[PDB]
């Protein structure tokens, strides 16, 4: 059985989030949680919250027994960007991009 949780419009660049994503691709959830517990990155918190939500979804809606789940799929996409202005010397102006991302995690008893 497949269960999905998502986080959309997360405030972080996708390149920075992809580094944490592949640390847990294909692991059992029990060890993935404690791996995410001891990485000193901002994105680890977001990924951990998404993973816990997915586990809760799988346990409540569909069948139980979180003791046999694995991380089957996980990927990060790019969301919309916000544009701002930063002044530079001699009266020039520059464009600043504030990038976001979407996070998807799939867990499965199989």
């Amino acid at each position: 059985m497949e269960t999905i949780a998502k986080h959309r419009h997360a405030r972080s660049s996708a390149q920075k989030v992809r580094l944490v994503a592949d640390l847990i691709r294909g692991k059992k959830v029990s060890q993935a949680l404690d791996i995410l517990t001891y990485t000193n990155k901002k994105a680890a918190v977001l990924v951990k919250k998404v993973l816990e939500s997915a586990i809760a979804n799988a346990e409540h809606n569909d069948g139980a027994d979180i003791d046999d789940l694995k991380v089957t799929k996980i990927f990060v996409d790019e969301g919309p960007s916000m544009k701002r202005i930063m002044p530079r010397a001699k009266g020039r102006a520059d464009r600043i991009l504030k990038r976001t991302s979407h996070i998807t995690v799939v867990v499965s008893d199989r």
């Binding site: 916000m82 544009k83 701002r84 202005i85 009266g91 020039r92 102006a93």
Partner: peptide, 26 residues
């Protein structure tokens, strides 16, 4: 809340440089 708006500024530049000697001057 959760709705965002902005504008732009385009005054470009105001040349007048190259204060050093000419490349292949007289």
């Amino acid at each position: 809340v959760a709705v965002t708006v902005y504008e732009a500024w385009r005054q470009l530049g105001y040349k007048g440089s190259w204060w050093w000697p000419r490349i292949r001057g007289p």
